[PDB]
């Protein structure tokens, strides 16, 4: 007969994980928005919290 590939048993294989990266490039920078002022900082840091100034 044969050795018959129906017979010796074939293993399988694996390797570690690799991180995929979804790509839609997000820039639309630099532009407005940019350029923090000191005033919106006066909104930013406590104390005297929100809501927003005028």
């Amino acid at each position: 007969a044969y050795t018959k590939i129906s017979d010796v048993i074939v293993p399988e294989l694996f390797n570690p994980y690799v991180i995929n990266t979804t790509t839609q490039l997000s820039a639309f920078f630099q532009s407005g928005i940019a350029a923090t002022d000191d005033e919106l900082n006066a909104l930013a840091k406590k104390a005297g919290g929100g809501s927003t100034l005028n």
Binding site: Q24, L25, S26, S31, T36, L43, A44, K46, S51, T52
Partner: protein
């Protein structure tokens, strides 16, 4: 898993910020006749976005000019630009594909821009022209910027972020109407309606124009 996702978390917020920005601009120019002087519309099926309409948008600020610098864009738009860019002189073929600048103006290419759809399979594009540098925003801070907890009897672990920031053009004055809350507003609600400008005439500084793509 936690290691990986923690590794990726950083760049995530970017696209969120962007999502906010486009939303808010869309609001500013939304359906308010007070802004008509800063916008232009090529709809109704004539006009291609070429070489002229661009000039109109450029001079839509009559005296003050060259306060515009960089141009928003979408892929297919830049494409059509190129296919009209081909000279007859000179040549087939030498130039060309990518072409910063356009006319003495920066160009930024991105795939994600507002694109509407009508019937008859007619696409419409937006392409903000700002050249501002800029609108404005500030970072701000919460307390407890980052934290980790777990369910002890079940098996879980979590992460959280919760950051504050303040952003707006000045620019139009913000108004209080038609909003629950409060605060913040929302996404949809931040886009909904009812902003009221006061300067007016100039020094905003942004303009948008809608156009059909070249046949």
């Amino acid at each position: 898993p936690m290691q990986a996702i923690g590794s990726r978390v950083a760049a995530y917020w970017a696209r969120e910020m962007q999502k906010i920005v486009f939303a808010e601009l869309a609001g500013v120019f939304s359906n308010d006749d007070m802004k008509d002087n800063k916008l232009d519309i090529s709809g109704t099926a004539d006009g291609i976005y070429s070489a002229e309409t661009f000039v109109d948008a450029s001079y839509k600020l009559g005296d003050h000019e060259s306060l515009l610098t960089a141009i928003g864009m979408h892929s297919a738009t830049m494409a059509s630009a190129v296919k009209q860019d081909l000279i007859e002189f000179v040549k087939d073929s030498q130039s060309g594909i990518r072409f910063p600048t356009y006319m003495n103006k920066r160009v930024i290419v991105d795939d994600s821009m507002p694109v509407e759809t009508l019937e008859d399979g007619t696409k419409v594009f937006t392409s903000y022209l700002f050249g501002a540098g800029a609108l404005g925003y500030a970072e701000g801070q919460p307390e407890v910027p980052t934290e980790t907890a777990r369910n002890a009897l079940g098996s879980q672990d979590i992460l959280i972020n919760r950051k504050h920031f303040v952003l707006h053009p000045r620019g139009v004055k913000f108004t209080e109407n038609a909003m629950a809350g409060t605060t913040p507003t929302d996404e949809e609600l931040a886009n909904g309606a009812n902003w009221q400008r006061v300067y007016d005439p100039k020094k905003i500084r942004i303009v948008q124009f809608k156009h059909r793509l070249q046949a």
